[PDB]
Amino acid sequence: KDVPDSQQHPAPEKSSKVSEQLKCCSGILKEMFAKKHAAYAWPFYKPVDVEALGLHDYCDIIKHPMDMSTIKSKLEAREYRDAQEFGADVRLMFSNCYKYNPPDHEVVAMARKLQDVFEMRFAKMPDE
């Protein structure tokens, strides 16, 4: 309680803001996971299937394919060091879209649109 040890961890023992944020994040991603953003988050709700979409180039592009579900799940898995891990992979999932695809692409189209929701979401997160 009230420790100045913030080198290896920014958090106290863990989460002064984080898990509150993640919890925010989830409601924020699971927000994106809402059937409203699922016009523009659903290639994100789930991972890149490189054998599916016909990628094969993928492993050139997509090192760390992120998707809503994954930053959602990691979020909920509490891999999320905090929201900045949340919005990290939300945007990384927005990235895997941009890296692979042209920025006029449907997936990237979501990403920028999810960026309307997500980042607005993200901004209403804790921090205090």
Binding site: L53, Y100, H105, V107
Partner: peptide
């Protein structure tokens, strides 16, 4: 290689 592919979205064809 050259990025000929993209994440194919909805087989409309």
């Amino acid at each position: 290689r050259t990025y000929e592919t993209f994440k194919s979205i909805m087989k409309k064809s």
